[PDB]
Amino acid sequence: EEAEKAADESERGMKVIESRAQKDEEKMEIQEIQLKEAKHIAEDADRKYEEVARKLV
């Protein structure tokens, strides 16, 4: 009976922690996408700023 209790609790732990891990995987993918987008926007902003500074001079 103690072994069965341990097995049931362990099965639940597997389901919940696997859900956690999948959520972490989706969050990493989303964060990488956001990071790349932010980096490209920053590059574009820097280029436009350099152009505007040349024109300003």
Partner: protein, 160 residues
């Protein structure tokens, strides 16, 4: 650029290999294959200090030799060797006056191209015509054929 390129050429081969490795690390995944304001600021954050954007622009302008607005390997060496200030400890005003006088041997107030050339000839090193022209331009600002004292003072920046 003068002291910078001098220090660059003073580097060893193993040092330059480490510099190339660090460059590949900085442009790791970049889109221009060089270190721009974005990539330089990313590296600065990875380190800890935060750099001003206008400061990033002024720095990239103090290391480039091409005109790309980004730092490549040839400019990576300059950006990674500029730490030591070679052009510091300016000579005393009396020493500067002595320099101008001995460069103006005929006592006239101007360092004509003849004096500069004979000086380069006297130094002993193999003087290339391109070197003569570049130094003549660096000194003689208005390009009148002679280096006055103000133009000579201008000739002391980047020199030590």
């Amino acid at each position: 650029d003068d002291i910078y390129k001098a220090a660059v050429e003073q580097l060893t081969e193993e040092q330059k290999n480490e510099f190339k490795a660090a460059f590949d690390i900085f442009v790791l995944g970049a889109e221009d294959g060089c270190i721009s304001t974005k990539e330089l600021g990313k590296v600065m954050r990875m380190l800890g200090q935060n750099p001003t954007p206008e400061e990033l622009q002024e720095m990239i302008d103090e290391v480039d030799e091409d005109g790309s607005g980004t730092v490549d390997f040839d400019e990576f060496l300059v950006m990674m060797v500029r730490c030591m200030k070679d052009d510091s400890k300016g000579k005393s005003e009396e020493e500067l006056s002595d320099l101008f006088r001995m460069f103006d041997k005929n006592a006239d107030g101007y360092i004509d191209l003849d004096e500069l050339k004979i000086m380069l000839q006297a130094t002993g090193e193999t003087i290339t015509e391109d070197d003569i022209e570049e130094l003549m331009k660096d000194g003689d600002k208005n390009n009148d054929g002679r280096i006055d004292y103000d133009e000579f003072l201008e000739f002391m920046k980047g020199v030590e």
